[PDB]
Amino acid sequence: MLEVCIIGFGFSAIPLVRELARTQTEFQIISAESGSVWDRLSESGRLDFSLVSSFQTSFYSFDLVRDYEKDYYPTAKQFYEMHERWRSVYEEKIIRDFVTKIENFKDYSLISTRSGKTYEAKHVVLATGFDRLMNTFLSNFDNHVSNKTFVFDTMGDSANLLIAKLIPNNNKIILRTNGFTALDQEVQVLGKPFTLDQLESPNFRYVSSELYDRLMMSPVYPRTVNPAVSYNQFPLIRRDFSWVDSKSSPPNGLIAIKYWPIDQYYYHFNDDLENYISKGYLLNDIAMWLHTGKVILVPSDTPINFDKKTITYAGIERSFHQYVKGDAEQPRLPTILINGETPFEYLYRDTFMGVIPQRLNNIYFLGYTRPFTGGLANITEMQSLFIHKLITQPQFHQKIHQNLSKRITAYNQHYYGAAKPRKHDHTVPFGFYTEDIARLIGIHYQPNECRSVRDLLFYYAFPNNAFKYRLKGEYAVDGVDELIQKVNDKHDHYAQVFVQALSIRNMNSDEAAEWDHSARRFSFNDMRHKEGYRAFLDTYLKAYRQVENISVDDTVVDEEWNFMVKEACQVRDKVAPNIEEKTHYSKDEDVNKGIRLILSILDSDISSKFEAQSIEFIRRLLQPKNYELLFIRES
Ligand SMILES: Cc1cc2nc3c(=O)[nH]c(=O)nc-3n(C[C@H](O)[C@H](O)[C@H](O)COP(=O)(O)OP(=O)(O)OC[C@H]3O[C@@H](n4cnc5c(N)ncnc54)[C@H](O)[C@@H]3O)c2cc1C
Ligand SMILES: [Cl-]
């Protein structure tokens, strides 16, 4: 009987197939001839965009050890070409067919296919991805439409991409909204560029959940009164977060849009704009669009007449060309029968770590957990190690399964509390999830084993990417020592991130929120760095039109739109004048002082005013008081 059958081969399955091949475990892959969304986008010439996630978090460790030389955002073409390279390596292991049904029994499953052939396997892994309505819409979009109005009832990374393609042709965008969370995908730290995933230092949650909450949440929840942040200039961007009940922040179930702020876009791309646009680097700065009025936010109950295609706002009956509403993704699962009889109903909270459904036996799910920030690779690489160990080590399979229902209950109590289930439950902070899996497998690090300040920087501030856990032990990858060294040298050993936590250790949440927004450029949604890029935006629109071979008449003044913008931006016009120029920027000065201190004691042993108080905090990091995670235990 077949030891392992993997159903679906795209991107998520690659690291699991690698480990099964290494241990020479018997496996077979079954994957559809139709392919993936990337295949159909490639065939229609629509891989003309870029990822919302950094290279280090979006490609697997065994590629990074060869190819990493700098932080950057890959293109969609680069991502798909990597899928195809690995498909070519493993194609001899792939049967091209479509699984229609799985009958699950006590220790094996019977797999049915559209061709009529059946397969038996002890262990079955599903890696089939999601269906998304927005995908078809992206695949049929005519990007030459010009001088029209669009109404959106949803906002998300796919809607933000469509908006980026519409803005250059003088199209006007109305968002009927109940709020959204958007975050600059690259920020400045003392002028230097960092991708947002580098700033999260997740293991500081072990110091205390309250400290970590202060470190992370002021850009998401409306905690600062600073008139420069977008959620004070445009209050309709604020979401209702009354559902949150967990003390673990950012909460499981929070989602965010990641976008290019125009200042960092200028820094990277101004010298070769037409080529960068043609490669897929599109300016998608939703904060710049709100600043300029090219997008307006209106209340969710603003009335729409769908027969006449009008929306009524500011006393104006505004005609619109197209209405856009996204849909809920759903996992692409075949029929699955419990004990060969009872249809299985998929529920994220009823699985362990999104991988092990407790209602089935020896069936595992790979690729159905989504990261809050960064790429899917971090998640699926760790899931693959977890699945590989469950399949190949019976003692580990038993250790996890013997108390599986108790582990799931404990996980849900920790991360969701009494909150009712939500459709976005499957989204997790990536550096909590990777560390959780590492502790379950046993490839984690121990804070008490740090000897020097440099060791503490690696433990707490070096990002919890999957490759962090593949230097030593069971799942070691050749070349990770050099990769970690290069990343450390290019980021000053993450001292600047380490010092953030040091700086807010004694603040309450209001003080920490004010401190976060006291920088000359704070990380997220800083509306002081938009007006100065108006001339560049004109240059960008011209470049975009040249690449798409479009001529756009922008001579006609749309006074009606200008009136609607004025109504929509009343709060901005009252709040923005309160922005004050400052002589000193507390956060910039505090971080600069902290970096100098840390780099000066980098190689000091831990056992050997501000400096004294900082050294005391550092010594306490060897014995963090909030390390317990009850769902890791075997009891
Ligand atoms: C527009 C878009 C942009 C994205 N951008 C990013 C980004 O910037 N960063 C990031 O990290 N992720 C991004 N993703 C998410 C993610 O990386 C992709 O969704 C990725 O394709 C998921 O890989 P997968 O292997 O899980 O699924 P897929 O790539 O969809 O592969 C699954 C395969 O299984 C096959 N299959 C399905 N059902 C069956 C069956 N019953 N029998 C046999 N075969 C079957 C399918 O035909 C397919 O070939 C994006 C996704 C989309 C749609
Ligand atoms: Cl990177």
Numbering used by the authors: 1 to 608, 629 to 655
Task: Quote what the paper states about this structure.
The flavin-dependent halogenase (FDH) AetF successively brominates tryptophan at C5 and C7 to generate 5,7-dibromotryptophan. In contrast to the well studied two-component tryptophan halogenases, AetF is a single-component flavoprotein monooxygenase. A large domain tightly binds the cofactor flavin adenine dinucleotide (FAD), while the small domain responsible for binding the nicotinamide adenine dinucleotide (NADP) is unoccupied. About half of the protein forms additional structural elements containing the tryptophan binding site.
